[PDB]
Amino acid sequence: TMVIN
Amino acid sequence: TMVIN
Amino acid sequence: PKKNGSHQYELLKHAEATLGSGNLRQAVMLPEGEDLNEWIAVNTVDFFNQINMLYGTITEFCTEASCPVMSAGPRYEYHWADGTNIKKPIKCSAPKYIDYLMTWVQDQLDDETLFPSKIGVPFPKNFMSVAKTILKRLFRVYAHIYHQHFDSVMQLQEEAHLNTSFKHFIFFVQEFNLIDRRELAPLQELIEKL
Amino acid sequence: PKKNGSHQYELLKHAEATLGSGNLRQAVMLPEGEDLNEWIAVNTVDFFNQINMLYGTITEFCTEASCPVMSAGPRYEYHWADGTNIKKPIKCSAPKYIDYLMTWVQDQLDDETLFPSKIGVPFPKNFMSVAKTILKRLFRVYAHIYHQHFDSVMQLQEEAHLNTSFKHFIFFVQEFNLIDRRELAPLQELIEKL
Ligand SMILES: [Zn+2]
Ligand SMILES: [Zn+2]
């Protein structure tokens, strides 16, 4: 649900 | 409507 | 328990949110490019709701017994008259007077020639007069609660609720010239400290 | 255009008025003797309404074109999943995601086993979990507006509206421990200044 680079 | 003493 | 509204609903939420800065003289001012009548109408409704709930908290302490008259202090006494149903002011109890008063404000709020719900319909040319009469009469509900019932207001903890809503009320009517000094005389001492 | 309500309606007006002191860490605290679930439920609804209207002001600038993803900054990207209809998170546009998100929050608000309208019915034992999920997901709408659309927020003058509502939002979730630091990371710089 929450993706980070 | 508005009375004062 | 209520939820999604436009366009005067954003205005209401706009005004409610912007108070959170604590500077009420700025958040009370007309937003750029907003209709003056609609900005006063939106806040007049919210004031009516607020003072309706504030008086509702102390409603068990305000009776035909302890309040045979409408009073802000011993110096000021209010007798009820509106347009037609009651022309000559009539002496009644503070609970009954506020019932006359709040039922009357509701009637204007539900009049679409006065407060039109369609977003494109102009407020009437006399709207400013009608709104001044509403707010000057709702102020008296603050005045009666402060003078008579403030001890009940502190038994419940509503005192912050009432003072913040009253501070917002005074700064709003002052900004837009909505009430005469002669009407605010009962709370004038408190008004000068705010 | 709305008017008289009880008892969670006084609570909502209570919270809205008490912000006018400008000290939001005090007005956010649970009033003495008030149900914790009801105080969070009342503010969660108001937050939903506020952010619904804030996003509604900029809704013409947030499109499938300029926002092919849900983004708070380039570092953070949100893919939508709830319980069942969507289990595995799905990549979609920021307008479509917020539509999924706000329609989902509404569904919980309209669930009386979650947010009961009868004043005597206890909130469910898991209510705290359900409310944390709502607020953590509504925060992301602040985050997307701040990172992407803040220029539109200042073309309209909503910036005070949004910052006051966001300050109230952060101080509320912080008081009651409603959101993890890992979720507030996108606005962490702004959060530290508030
Ligand atoms: Zn009384
Ligand atoms: Zn966008």
Residue numbers in the entry:
A (entry chain E), B (entry chain E): 5 to 9
C (entry chain A), D (entry chain A): 15 to 18, 22 to 211
Which text from the study accompanies this structure?
The core kinase cascade is modulated by adaptor proteins, SAV1 (Salvador, also known as WW45) and MOB1 (encoded by MOB1A and MOB1B in human), both of which work to promote Hippo pathway signaling. MOB1 directly binds to LATS1 and LATS2, and additionally to two related kinases, NDR1, (gene name STK38) and NDR2 (gene name STK38L) via a specialized MOB1-binding domain N-terminal to the kinase domain. Key to its function as a Hippo pathway activator is the ability of MOB1 to bind directly to MST1 and MST2 kinases. We demonstrate that autophosphorylation of MST1 and MST2 on several threonine residues provides multiple MOB1 binding sites with varying binding affinities which in turn contribute to a redundancy of MST1-MOB1 protein interactions in cells.
Peptide overlay analysis (here referred to as Far-Western) revealed that peptides bearing phosphorylated forms of T353 and T367 consistently gave the highest binding signals across the array; nonphosphorylated versions of these peptides generated little to no binding signal. MST1 T353 and T367 peptides displayed high phospho-dependent binding affinities for MOB1A, with Kds of 280 nm and 680 nm for the phosphorylated peptides, respectively, and no detectable binding for the nonphosphorylated peptides. Consistent with their P0 positional binding preferences, human MOB1 bound more tightly to the MST1 pT367 peptide than to the optimized Nud1-like phosphoserine containing peptide than did yeast Mob1, and vice versa. The observed binding modes revealed by these structures are in close agreement with the binding modes reported previously for a yeast Nud1 derived phosphopeptide in complex with human MOB1A, as well as a MST2 T378 phosphopeptide in complex with human MOB1B (see ref 21, 22). As predicted by prior mutational data, the MST1 pT353 and pT367 phosphopeptides bound to the MOB1A phospho-binding pocket first identified by Rock et al., with the phosphate of the P0 threonine directly coordinated by K153, R154 and R157. The p + 1 side chains of M354 and M368 on MST1-pT353 and MST1-pT367 peptides respectively resided in an expansive hydrophobic surface composed by A89, A92, Y93, Y95, F156 and A160 side chains on MOB1A. The p + 3 side chain of I370 in the MST1-pT367 peptide oriented toward the same hydrophobic surface. The p + 2 side chains of I355 and V369 in MST1-pT353 and MST1-pT367 peptides respectively pointed to a distinct surface composed by M87, Y95 and the aliphatic portion of the E94 side chain on MOB1A. Thus, the hydrophobic nature of the p + 1 to p + 3 binding surfaces explained the consensus preferences for hydrophobic residues at these positions.
